[PDB]
Protein: Carbonic anhydrase 2
Amino acid sequence: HHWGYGKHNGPEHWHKDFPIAKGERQSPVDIDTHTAKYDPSLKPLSVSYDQATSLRILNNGHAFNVEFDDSQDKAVLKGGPLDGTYRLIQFHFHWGSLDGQGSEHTVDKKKYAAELHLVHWNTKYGDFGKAVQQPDGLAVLGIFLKVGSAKPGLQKVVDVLDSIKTKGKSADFTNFDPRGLLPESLDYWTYPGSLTTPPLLECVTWIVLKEPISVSSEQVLKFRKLNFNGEGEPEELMVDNWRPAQPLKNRQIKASFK
Ligand SMILES: [N]S(=O)(=O)[N][C]C1234B567B89%10B5%11%12B85%13B98%14B%1061B821B326B%115(B%12724)C%13%1416
Ligand SMILES: [Zn+2]
Structure:
């Protein structure tokens, strides 16, 4: 009886196996733009993805994951709220069954069609597994998707999804440049939170970009043809793989922009 997004194993059940689900710094959260405060102590954000080496794309039964070679300092996130250097390990999306839902973070309670998460670990901790035992182990760059014009930098991902339809399937996915998934502006909000999936670990410095990227209805429709189930099992479309907003508790959301 594994965790998932259904009625009997979804977000309202996760706390039974992962009691940190009811913790003091869970994600995602609603970003109340009027309560968010500009923070002059934030340094410029540095997203340095020129040398990123992608390896593989994987359907893990919850999302599709594009995985990178993180054995050297290549694709790194620095600056902003971060102390030190965080290495890109993978990215994935959360999306809806309909265009009106799919994001995990919300903005004044607005839900976007999807949300991209670029996951990075703090290189002072040596490896990802050690980083996830630290309160500043991870940084996730979150980017909202709205439906409108196509995102040409996404199409290579969309086009390989047919080959990883079911849980456990993977495909080679080299030479993919995640710079093509970024909006023009790096204006962002930041707060301390958690992974939004089990194990829900409270390691994450969240950096959520204000500017969404636009993707086409056809692009997102292809996300929604993936399957949660494995090959030869009854078809359950991979849709609505998002956790809703959690209590803000004793936190403040800071803005990089005035
Ligand atoms: N939405 S999230 O980025 O908080 N969680 C996604 C994960 B997938 B699995 B991979 B590993 B586990 B799960 B957790 B991070 B990485 B990424 C770790
Ligand atoms: Zn995620």
